[PDB]
Design a protein around this ligand. Structure first.
Ligand SMILES: NC(=O)c1ccc[n+]([C@@H]2O[C@H](COP(=O)([O-])OP(=O)(O)OC[C@H]3O[C@@H](n4cnc5c(N)ncnc54)[C@H](OP(=O)(O)O)[C@@H]3O)[C@@H](O)[C@H]2O)c1
Ligand SMILES: NC(=O)c1ccc[n+]([C@@H]2O[C@H](COP(=O)([O-])OP(=O)(O)OC[C@H]3O[C@@H](n4cnc5c(N)ncnc54)[C@H](OP(=O)(O)O)[C@@H]3O)[C@@H](O)[C@H]2O)c1
Lengths: 248, 250
């Protein structure tokens, strides 16, 4: 009876905040993770102990076979799907483009772009009115990097997010007639572990004087925008974006 | 001075790239004609250019392959000893389809040519053009597509996404290399009369869609070439990180 939401990369950061908020709003939640099983299981436990429904599933979204298995686990546990949040994403050490090699480009596009395509594909196969579904929504997680370009940091990642923006528009226009809305959020500088993963734990503090609102954002702020776009309150919005960037 | 500037055109053997190479060869450039599957077309173009009084070098390289890209630029170093402009024109798409039928293998191929190839060539160009590395500066022109804005629904959202990646790389690289003398811009062609539409499964695509183009016709490869050359030229000396749509209003 609950609507079912898959959040890719739900073990930490924005995905974890989105999973907890979705459970508070009455969704059954699928928490996908890769390298942080214990973090995902702790979130599952928090949701279940409070009377909610949650399923934690390891899957590398870059890997077609893992994505197939992830969605098969959803089919088995819940037998339906209503929302996909394409949140899993990653970046590598800050760099100039002249030091980005093909292996890095493959890894960065594989997680951020291919993974979002593959999960969107399997979600369409469950949500679409062509295929036994009731319709639903997809929310992609982009980045202000798509607009700003991440110079001297990670133009590869900025390009991956530009790809997400175009996929959001194309897929929205492609599956509108099948009951599926597709939108994206573009977070700005949000306090998660991702900045440290690029080599700069203090990135927000360095940049905050230039953010119009004068502070970094929170994972919970992003989660609220994701949930709004996934909800029926956004019933006439498809192919659009909510920037969650404090004016950046 | 008496020496021509040097322009690499990726995917110069056919279509937009071939028109760009022919025009550039008459605009003060010795041209490097990169090809992959169409050596004979590239060699004929080289001969046409050398008979119009120009200079041209044809070089096989798959831009998706880092080793081929390294060798491509080494060939330029050996022949000309200099580089001034990169046109990241090589691109491709696969059969018209819906996203639910696009697999990982297709995504990898499409991103490899369109995105990775443009990154890898831009990287080799920066190493040579940058004033930090002893260069004189120069420019890079990426070839995007109106697909980045329209999304190519029901045709090739994968390719649209690849071109969205190019748009963001254009902006980011422009900002990253502005202070070392390199400008970076892009063209977004709309419906241009080349073989690419047939390669997607629809030779008649322009005829199907032209009634909806404001200008009422497809564009030509020569039209795109002129915009590329403008952005590469010194007339665009205060433009970096920008786009020109060549789409007839689409
Ligand atoms: N924080 C920001 O400032 C910011 C700004 C704009 C956009 N974003 C975007 O926000 C999204 C969430 O990132 P975050 O900031 O929350 O970062 P984070 O703290 O690094 O969390 C990343 C999450 O993605 C998962 N993940 C990474 N690669 C994966 C893969 N191949 N398969 C499955 N899961 C994978 C991780 O799972 P495991 O840990 O279990 O491996 C983790 O749950 C990403 O798309 C990111 O690009 C973040
Ligand atoms: N025509 C349009 O309507 C249109 C619209 C928007 C954007 N574009 C873009 O314009 C650019 C040129 O397209 P086009 O219409 O002229 O296409 P085209 O007629 O199909 O020609 C493609 C060219 O790219 C080369 N190429 C393809 N893959 C390559 C690779 N891996 N390495 C090196 N060269 C490669 C081909 O060389 P070989 O034949 O020697 O393999 C050929 O010269 C592409 O980036 C395309 O995305 C075209």
């Amino acid at each position: 009876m609950r609507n079912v939401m898959l959040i890719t990369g739900a073990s930490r950061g924005i995905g974890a905040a989105t999973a907890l908020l979705a459970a508070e709003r009455g969704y059954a939640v699928v928490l996908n993770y890769l390298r942080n099983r214990e973090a995902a299981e702790a979130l599952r436990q928090r949701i279940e102990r409070q009377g909610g429904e949650a399923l934690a599933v390891a899957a590398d979204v870059a890997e077609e076979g893992d994505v197939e298995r992830l969605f098969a686990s959803i089919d088995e546990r819940f037998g339906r799907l209503d929302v996909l949040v394409n949140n899993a994403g990653m970046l590598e050490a800050q760099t100039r483009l002249e030091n980005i090699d093909a292996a890095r480009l493959h890894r960065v596009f594989a997680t951020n772009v291919t993974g979002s395509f593959l999960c969107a594909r399997e979600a369409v196969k469950r949500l679409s009115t062509r295929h036994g579904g009731r319709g639903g929504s997809i929310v992609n997680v982009s980045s202000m990097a798509s607009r700003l370009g991440s110079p001297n940091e990670y133009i590869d990642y900025a390009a991956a997010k530009g790809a997400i923006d175009s996929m959001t528009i194309g897929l929205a226009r492609e599956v509108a007639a099948e009951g599926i809305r597709v939108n994206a959020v573009r977070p700005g500088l949000i306090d998660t572990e991702i900045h440290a993963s690029g080599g700069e734990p203090g990135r927000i503090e360095r940049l905050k004087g230039g953010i119009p609102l004068g502070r970094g954002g929170t994972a919970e702020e992003v989660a609220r925008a994701i949930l709004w776009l996934a909800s029926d309150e956004a019933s006439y919005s498809t192919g659009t974006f909510i920037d969650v960037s404090g004016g950046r």
